[PDB]
Design a protein around this ligand. Structure first.
Ligand SMILES: Nc1nc2c(ncn2[C@@H]2O[C@H](COP(=O)(O)OP(=O)(O)O)[C@@H](O)[C@H]2O)c(=O)[nH]1
Ligand SMILES: [Cl-]
Ligand SMILES: [Cl-]
Length: 147
């Protein structure tokens, strides 16, 4: 399965990738690409990325970062609307659930406008990337929904 992992900078993408790696004993067919979106995107606004071949999207959100949730919402909807992304299965990692007063998954659903995503499979997984909680649960949802 070809999975794209996106999120604003500091969402926890690097941490999830190293923690998922640490969980493997000492998902063989999963391929991952990863980059930052939003104001700290290396390419926007002068060029677009290309999303060819993407089967699954993992969108990582810092749930304690209310100041940037609107920017995360705008990036998510812009990406999923690209021609090459119209069939992509969407996993949202609602990251940093360990932090006091972090936004819970139902608030994430509302703040990301997920209810307006029709004719496409999506799921919100609560996670704490530093402890590894919810990471395999999210990756299992994504890969099982792909089959
Ligand atoms: N409290 C807490 N910190 C996290 C969690 N996930 C990542 N971090 C921290 O948030 C910061 C940015 O994470 P990083 O993985 O580098 O984000 P990236 O820019 O999206 O790759 C780092 O200091 C991570 O330790 C989490 O679940 N809880
Ligand atoms: Cl783009
Ligand atoms: Cl454009």
């Amino acid at each position: 399965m070809r999975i794209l992992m996106l999120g604003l900078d500091a969402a926890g993408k690097t941490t999830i990738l190293y923690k998922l790696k640490l969980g493997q004993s000492v998902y063989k067919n999963v391929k991952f690409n990863v980059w930052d979106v939003g104001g700290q995107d290396k390419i926007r606004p002068l060029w677009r990325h290309y999303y060819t071949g993407t089967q699954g999207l993992i969108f990582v959100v810092d749930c304690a970062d209310r100041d940037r949730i609107d920017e995360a919402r705008q990036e998510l909807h812009r990406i999923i609307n690209d021609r090459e992304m119209r069939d992509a299965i969407i996993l949202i990692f609602a990251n940093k659930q360990d932090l006091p007063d972090a936004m819970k998954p139902h608030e994430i659903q509302e703040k990301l406008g997920l209810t307006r995503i029709r004719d496409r499979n999506w799921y919100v997984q609560p996670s704490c990337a530093t402890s590894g909680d919810g990471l395999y649960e999210g990756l299992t949802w994504l890969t099982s929904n792909y089959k």
